[PDB]
Ligand binder design. Structure first.
Ligand SMILES: Nc1nc2c(ncn2[C@@H]2O[C@H](COP(=O)(O)OP(=O)(O)OP(=O)(O)O)[C@@H](O)[C@H]2O)c(=O)[nH]1
Ligand SMILES: Nc1nc2c(ncn2[C@@H]2O[C@H](COP(=O)(O)OP(=O)(O)OP(=O)(O)O)[C@@H](O)[C@H]2O)c(=O)[nH]1
Ligand SMILES: Nc1nc2c(ncn2[C@@H]2O[C@H](COP(=O)(O)OP(=O)(O)O)[C@@H](O)[C@H]2O)c(=O)[nH]1
Ligand SMILES: Nc1nc2c(ncn2[C@@H]2O[C@H](COP(=O)(O)OP(=O)(O)O)[C@@H](O)[C@H]2O)c(=O)[nH]1
Ligand SMILES: [Mg+2]
Ligand SMILES: [Mg+2]
Lengths: 130, 11, 428, 426, 428, 426
């Protein structure tokens, strides 16, 4: 088994991440099977071989059609695993990134409450003067 | 019109 | 004294009910006129000289399909004001069907709902049909959801939503309509059945061998699913199933209430010439992963609950034996906290065939109701296509400039992520 | 019911519009005298979408025939089906716009816009609740482009939440009648992008190419050129007249195509187009219909759509056809030439099935899509404008009639802003 | 109770399996459409009121032979998805019949095989019929039987291969297409029976004296053999024998599993009525080399095991009389390590010979299935022709073009070479 | 089902292919007005391989008719069964190649190649699955040897997994029409031996030679001369259309008559061949059909197999006829012609039997074969270059369209190399 030992240590990172309640994360078991699926469509490439024969243009075009099938397949196998690192690491970083922009609503709410309570003070002062 | 006969063709 | 109330919102729901109440009329012996020449009481009322009228409403915002039914052959079956007709089509817009074109006919709709639901006590629940990919289905039908949630608190509601396709389009705005409507059906519906067009497409391509069917060929198969769902409510049987049995005995959690339907056998007259439809092989085809009504593979899912209604000359021995051999089938995994995961109900009336269709006169049928984590990833692909065409602010001006605020998208993403929390912590 | 309103502008829009009412009268079976023949149910149900009852059993079109010169209104009424329109619906000019946008828009169409806005409003409050205005007008000519854009400016101020479809025919690069082509063209472009819910373009040079190589006509008269455009005219709005398995509106097409309000320029195509000796031997099947519709030789605009990307495309299907081959073959044209469709919108196609086939064809299709292959046409009007503006040529006829050169300078500024955000997404 | 499932892969498989089913339909008395105007359980189901359906599959990617049984005379004996067709031939190519063009249809076959297997338990074995020199019969025969040993591993399987000959093959790539699949039919299969074309040609030349019966009458003779093999399961007999007794009794070793077929008395309609076809002379004619069905001369070989399946009105006492005189004569020879080498199985039912076929009335008939070391000479010349072809890289470009790398010729070369060296260490 | 695309090139290609749709139409009972008569199941069951439903009930052949002169197009339409064809598949050429390869391929060949691809692609993709190509052209004229072979090379890139069957007629040694024959011959050969999967040679003087003393025809016209090679073309495709006991395909012939991909040149022949005054006077027996096959007096090539060795060869039988005699007679030809067959293949003879004969005869048989007897035709054009290319003659016409003598040396060299493995396997 060339890379079959890489699954088992991966969900051990999951169970530690679940027990850490501070860094709450959404469902990323889609994350497991795609880091599987991208890696399985990278292991066979030091075994994928083609052999030609006495060269006619029929042979060369179809036999090389295998090699742009899998040089394109390295391009697919890189691109879903990169975009899903882009979007789920986004949506787990978005909970602490939400925390800074709701540090501003704490400032806004305290400013409005303190200024309105000050407005209660000036209305109490002005009515007694009249 | 010839476009009428061609677009609406039955026989 | 005993009834259920159906809603059909959107052009999808109206055509679904066009074959649904065609099948119910011929199975009860009554004619499209309205009268036959007590077991029919849960769908049809009684009025004077043997007449029966449906307990149905047809809601639309465009006047095309509703007027066409009024001018169809079922003129005198439906009550003429149970078909509530709008003028402006909602036009694939969640904001239009909610905040601009919704309130002028949803008050008139609930005026009809109250009048027919207050007819008889012992009301069971609402069986509503919509498309969340459209405008009037996803906009007006969602508007029904919160107002039924505030005047009928304890009445059950069972969604039957045609969830949009994972592979084809027939619109380009179904990412916006569908996941905005799943916000306000988590907290409003109770058992939410997932249908898909291309699941129905595939099963009629091989199990019926229909090469090129239309939408009216789909609506008969949905009609047979609804009929086998409420068959134990209508006719006598050994193990009758109430609608309140589905909610209590299937969903384990209030938030986990999504669904994966299936039906078997859907057989043709030519193909039944060479096949005996024994109880063993019709439930193996019912648990067959390709023959599901939503296009999700349960092999990379995990079941938690199953409800089977057998409809016909079924014998209880190969009921328990065939669910035993599908329990020992290692390909069908079950969750570790539900050691028994089957609920078997038995009806005595065999399914009736609609003439001129492709289904054949069968002696028995299976209706498959499954709860599994396969529904977690039918929302994961639609979340996947959501962020791809939302990152550069596409189609926004038809929603924020129409009458709702920007930011309904952001927390529709948040409660869909919160949806997937519950659908993944339950599978461990 | 939902009613849609037609407005004819220019001699182009008067003749094209008058033949639009030929094919709607053909679908609905209306005689030239105004009566109805055929005795069919759903052919006459939603007749009100284009016609109004005249308490004599005749159906008057809700159209506004309108021009600066009475030469073309006389030709419409003298021709076939000319005894159908309302005499009040003809708004007569007398001087005639001399291929000048300035007098069309400011000084000669200004005393005619008040007369015609009263006529447009007359057919508006008389019903329950309308849908909008769809128009047909010219760009190269003065009486169409100069004064028609005034009417779009006026009706947006009074009816703001409606739909402005514009079937706008544009000047041709190769064949050049009306020597001041880009002057009347560009002066209505920036005054329509801020004014129209959707614009969809027609080109006479591409209409010539279709009738040559796919119709096999040796002598194409202007009536023939006005017919295959009129097939697409009837197609876009046919779903509001006949029922179907998946109905749609022009509200539906506008919301489900354009991503941003600054771009609403569509391409128009129609299929099947089959020659006289070829109707016998070509199988009208939906896979045959759908690649003809996705072909540059079928395109009514002479912008080569394979030189750019398709952003969002919507296609009806009109007839009794199965719905496998409705939807899965636009999946197939999404897949096979995936490099010809944009990436950041998934599943870029739309469908809507009407149940009634048109007259003589068992099934038909119209392509309506905001393909971003429009840059090369906005440049081919740009670079002839800038070539004739740096020499200050022919500007005494424009600056002398009530407008300044700053109106010109903001015209290339909206031109360049419009095409810069087109080239952004390609 | 007991059933047997037959596979029919390739052009030889479809036609041989064709004649197997008109013989069975006349034997059990079912007329073609499925009606009879419980001994038929092992080859037919019970699909309702008098309906019976065969239990088989018909696989061939050439649609030219499958549509012609679909639209021939037996259109409705078979299930509609029991007749499975591809789109294009494998065209004498093991490489793409196993890798590229055969892959999309194997799963479309095994979902019907799994359907037939879940009908009733007690499934006895897996007969199959293929050409070893045909591209579909070899590629799809191998690819089906690879994962069939994965899934239904313990169940036994029978083989009937139209093996080539030193003079007649109707092919030029025959050495390639044949022993490339012997790498699989040693490691996977259980009991394999070798057939030959001119062995059936000359058995009609010098016994029937018909100069022109075509391929259809060869299929009649093979149908005679298959029926006479399985009929001890089909009917009752004085000494019964079934498939799993064949599986145990004949093969001594797991790698010596290649039989040798014969039938007696294969006799014309004007010869048989004029002579005693007696037990003594029929057995004496069964072993003599002109009745053989592989064209292998057993003078330089020794019989391993010999199983004779009589039928008709054979009293079971002169079976032993006819065997005592055939063992004691020196023409046939056994290996020294089998003192006893025989088994006889009696069946009461005489043949119901197809009317108009070339066989005549036999009150008694034996089908001969014998292991022998005479499988050495049928394979040794096959290895010489493979060496004469592969030595200069002939025809390799048609194989490596689809995904079968060079080297699977060579690893099948010493698998075949391990087969012949397996033979002489057994004999000596 | 399988689809065979049947493309023409050059005047000789158009006349031969037009006779192909004579011999196929009457084997399928097809009236020239398109309707079918003949009430037999076996004709209509496999008909999509060569025809197409036209939603008229009538069948159009899937044939692309391509040439550079409209005169031979006029001869096709005016003759019998010429209305059955598809005129958008009629790709007209106007200027005409004057037997010049360079202007038929490079300069003017590049213009109509885009239109003929659009024709050949839109029934190839329109079918559910395709089997192979079937081309008829000539090496003599520059219109077919120039633009037809360009069509060989350009369908090559986008259809890689489909077989490539090519019927080509070759020059003459003794009588020489179109005197630039040797240049136009090998200028198609140097690409045909790597773009075409199987090449089948026809020769007009061998075909005359068959018409003389095995058909007893004193006055041989071009009509029946093309008809003999037309029935040979019908045979190699018939077993797809018709059932049999031992089935076969076009690609079935390819995968096993080609031990090495450079040698794929096959010798065509058709039996039985007898005079009108002996057709129902002679015993049609199975042994004497193969006597007519395996000789130099029926084969349709300018070759003597007596100077060569049949490396691999194949036979295809038609009609109700038993088959073990086929195997023993085709052993019996191998063991008496033992010095005429190679040794490094066992049992070199393919056998295929289909159960339906053509009309007129109760049984027929078609012979193909990869022999080394192609070699003497290739060195008899090679030594024409030894005499003519040495003189630098008739090359200013070629170099006027962008030709290089380095392309000519490649043309001579790879055909010289092609001879070298022909002699290597003898
Ligand atoms: N199963 C089924 N699906 C349908 C039917 N009608 C429409 N749909 C699907 O519903 C999806 C969108 O909803 P629609 O019904 O088309 O539109 P709508 O719900 O009426 O909303 P509007 O477009 O505003 O009128 C489409 O993608 C269709 O595939 C139907 O009759 N049966
Ligand atoms: N005895 C007998 N042998 C047959 C029959 N049909 C085909 N064969 C054998 O099959 C061999 C050729 O292979 P086929 O069976 O025709 O081909 P296939 O199995 O369909 O696979 P392909 O070669 O790809 O077409 C011949 O040499 C015959 O020996 C038949 O009806 N009876
Ligand atoms: N399709 C079409 N094009 C027209 C018609 N009349 C004029 N044109 C084109 O429009 C251009 C001139 O536009 P014109 O009618 O003078 O503009 P106007 O000022 O609005 O009348 C010419 O290049 C013509 O090719 C017509 O009836 N149909
Ligand atoms: N058998 C046969 N040969 C032909 C026919 N027409 C032309 N040829 C041969 O083709 C050669 C002429 O080349 P061709 O391709 O027809 O010229 P082009 O098509 O006009 O450029 C001559 O040597 C003719 O012998 C025909 O109808 N039958
Ligand atoms: Mg609608
Ligand atoms: Mg085959």
């Amino acid at each position: 088994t060339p890379a079959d030992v890489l699954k088992t240590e991966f969900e051990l990172k999951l169970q530690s991440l679940r027990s850490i309640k501070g860094s709450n994360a959404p469902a990323l078991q889609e994350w497991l099977r795609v880091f599987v699926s991208s890696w399985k469509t990278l292991q066979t490439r030091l075994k994928s071989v083609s052999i030609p024969e006495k060269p006619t243009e029929k042979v060369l075009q179809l036999a090389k059609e295998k090699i742009e099938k899998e040089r394109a397949l390295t391009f697919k196998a890189l691109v879903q695993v990169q975009q899903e690192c882009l979007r789920v690491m986004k949506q787990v970083f978005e909970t602490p990134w939400r925390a800074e922009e709701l540090a501003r609503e704490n400032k806004e709410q305290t400013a409005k409450i303190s200024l309105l309570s000050s407005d209660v003070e000036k209305t109490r002062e002005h009515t007694a003067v009249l | 019109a010839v476009a009428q006969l061609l677009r609406s063709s039955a026989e | 004294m005993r009834e259920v109330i159906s809603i059909h919102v959107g052009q999808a729901g109206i055509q679904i009910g066009n074959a649904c109440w065609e099948l119910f009329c011929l199975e009860h012996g009554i004619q499209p006129d309205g009268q036959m020449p007590d077991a029919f009481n849960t769908f049809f009322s009684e009025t004077g000289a043997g007449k029966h009228v449906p307990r149905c409403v047809f809601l639309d915002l465009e006047p095309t399909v509703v007027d066409e039914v009024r001018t169809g052959t079922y003129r005198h079956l439906f009550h003429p004001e149970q078909l509530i007709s709008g003028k402006e089509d909602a036009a694939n817009n969640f904001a239009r069907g909610h905040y601009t074109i919704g309130k002028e006919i949803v008050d008139l709709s609930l005026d009809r709902i109250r009048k027919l639901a207050d007819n008889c006590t012992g009301l069971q629940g609402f069986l509503m049909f919509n498309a969340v990919g459209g405008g009037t289905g996803s906009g007006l039908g969602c508007l029904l959801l919160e107002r039924l949630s505030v005047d009928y608190g304890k009445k059950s509601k069972l969604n039957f939503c045609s969830w949009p396709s994972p592979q084809v389009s027939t619109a380009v705005v179904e990412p916006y309509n569908s996941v905005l409507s799943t916000h306000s059906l988590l907290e409003h519906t109770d058992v939410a059945v997932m249908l898909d067009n291309e699941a129905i497409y595939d099963i009629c391509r091989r199990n019926l061998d229909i090469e090129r069917p239309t939408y009216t060929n789909l609506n008969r198969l949905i009609a047979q699913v609804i009929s086998s769902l409420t068959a134990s409510l209508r006719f006598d049987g050994a193990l009758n199933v109430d609608v309140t049995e589905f909610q209590t005995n299937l969903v384990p959690y209030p938030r986990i209430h999504f669904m994966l339907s299936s039906y078997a056998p859907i057989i043709s007259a030519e193909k039944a010439y060479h096949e005996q439809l024994s109880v063993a092989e019709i439930t193996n085809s019912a648990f067959e992963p390709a023959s599901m009504m939503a296009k999700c593979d349960p092999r990379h899912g995990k079941y938690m609950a199953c409800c089977l209604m057998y409809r016909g000359d079924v014998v209880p021995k190969d009921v328990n034996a065939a669910v035993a051999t599908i329990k020992t089938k290692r390909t069908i995994q079950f969750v570790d906290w539900c050691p028994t995961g089957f609920k078997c109900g038995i009806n005595y009336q065999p399914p009736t065939v609609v003439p001129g269709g492709d289904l054949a006169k069968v002696m028995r049928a299976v209706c498959m109701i499954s709860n599994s984590t396969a529904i977690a990833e039918v929302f994961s692909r639609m979340d996947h296509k959501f962020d791809l065409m939302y990152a550069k602010r596409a189609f926004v001006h038809w929603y924020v400039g129409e009458g709702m605020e920007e930011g309904e998208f952001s927390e529709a993403r948040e409660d869909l992520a919160a949806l997937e929390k519950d659908y993944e912590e339950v599978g461990i | 019911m939902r009613e849609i309103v037609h407005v004819q502008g220019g001699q182009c829009g008067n003749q094209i519009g008058a033949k639009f009412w030929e094919v709607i009268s053909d679908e609905h079976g209306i005689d030239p005298t105004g009566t109805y023949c055929g005795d069919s149910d759903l052919q006459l149900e939603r007749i009100n979408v284009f016609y109004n009852e005249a308490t004599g059993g005749r159906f008057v079109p809700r159209a506004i025939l309108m021009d600066l010169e009475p030469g073309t209104m006389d030709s419409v009424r003298a021709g076939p089906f000319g005894q159908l329109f309302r005499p009040d619906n003809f708004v007569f000019g007398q001087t005639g716009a001399g291929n000048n946008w300035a007098k069309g828009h400011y000084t000669e169409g200004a005393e005619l816009i008040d007369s015609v806005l009263d006529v447009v409003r007359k057919e508006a409050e008389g019903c329950d609740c309308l849908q909008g205005f769809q128009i047909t007008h010219s760009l190269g000519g003065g009486t169409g482009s100069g004064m028609g854009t005034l009417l779009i400016s006026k009706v947006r101020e009074e009816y703001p939440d409606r739909i402005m479809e514009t079937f706008s025919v544009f000047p041709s690069p190769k064949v050049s009648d009306t020597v001041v082509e880009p002057y009347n063209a560009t002066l209505s472009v920036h005054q329509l992008v801020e004014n129209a819910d959707e614009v969809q373009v027609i080109d006479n040079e591409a209409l010539y190419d279709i009738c040559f190589r796919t119709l096999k006509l040796t002598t194409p008269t202007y009536g023939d050129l006005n017919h295959l455009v009129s097939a697409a005219m009837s197609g876009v709005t046919c779903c509001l007249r006949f029922p179907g398995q998946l109905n749609s509106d022009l509200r539906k097409l506008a919301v489900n195509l354009i991503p941003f309000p600054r771009l609403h320029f569509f391409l128009i195509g129609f299929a099947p187009l089959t020659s006289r000796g070829s109707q016998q031997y070509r199988a009208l099947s939906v896979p045959e219909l759908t690649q003809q519709m996705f072909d540059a030789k079928n395109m009514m605009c002479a912008s080569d759509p394979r030189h750019g990307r398709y952003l969002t495309a919507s296609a009806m299907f009109r007839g009794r056809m199965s719905t496998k081959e409705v939807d899965e073959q636009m999946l197939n044209v999404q897949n096979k030439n995936s490099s010809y469709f944009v990436e950041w919108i998934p599943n870029n196609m739309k469908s809507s099935v009407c149940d009634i086939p048109p007259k003589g064809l068992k099934m038909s299709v119209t392509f309506v899509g905001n393909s971003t292959a429009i840059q090369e046409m906005f440049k081919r009007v740009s670079d002839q404008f800038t070539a004739m503006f740096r020499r200050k040529a022919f500007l005494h006829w424009y600056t002398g009639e009530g407008m300044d050169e700053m109106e010109f300078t903001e015209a290339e500024s909206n031109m360049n802003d419009l095409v810069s955000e087109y080239q952004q997404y390609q």
